[PDB]
């Protein structure tokens, strides 16, 4: 159901961020056929996730609220991870509550 091997992802949000500030990355599926994109983010806080589909691709925004390591799993057209997933993002700053 589409080819996860043809999905690329890039941007600052894949590597890091700071608490209470939004991070962004882009997932490009344009040559990967038609399939469902899955993005999950797991770590020391539950993040809010937005995706806006632009010409350059799926623009994903999230805001981490605690410092530490977040795992960003990106799968396409089934259970398979795209190349580089799960990405580990390191977030710094105060734990916000």
Contact positions vs Ni ion (CB under 5 A)? 51, 58
State the minimum distance, in angstroms, from the CB of residue 30 to Ni ion: 12
Cβ closest to Ni ion, residue 44 vs residue 59: 59
Q: What is the C-alpha separation between 66 and 43, in angstroms, rounded?
A: 8
Nearer to Ni ion, 58 or 75 (CB): 58
Q: Are 64 and 35 in contact (CB under 8 A)?
A: no
CB of 29 to Ni ion, least distance (A): 8
User: Are the beta carbons of 46 and 64 closer than 8 angstroms?
Assistant: no
CB of 31 closer than 8 Å to CB of 71: no
State the nearest-atom distance from the C-beta of 81 to Ni ion, in Å.
17
């Amino acid at each position: 159901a589409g080819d996860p091997g043809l999905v690329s992802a890039y941007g600052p949000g894949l590597e890091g961020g700071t608490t209470g500030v939004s991070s962004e990355f882009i997932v490009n599926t344009l040559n990967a056929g038609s399939g469902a994109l899955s993005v999950t983010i797991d770590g020391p806080s539950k993040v809010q996730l937005d995706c806006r589909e632009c010409p350059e691709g799926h623009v994903v925004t999230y805001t981490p609220m605690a410092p530490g390591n977040y795992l960003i799993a990106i799968k396409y057209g089934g259970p398979q991870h795209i190349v580089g997933s799960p990405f580990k993002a390191k977030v710094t700053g105060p734990r916000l509550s």
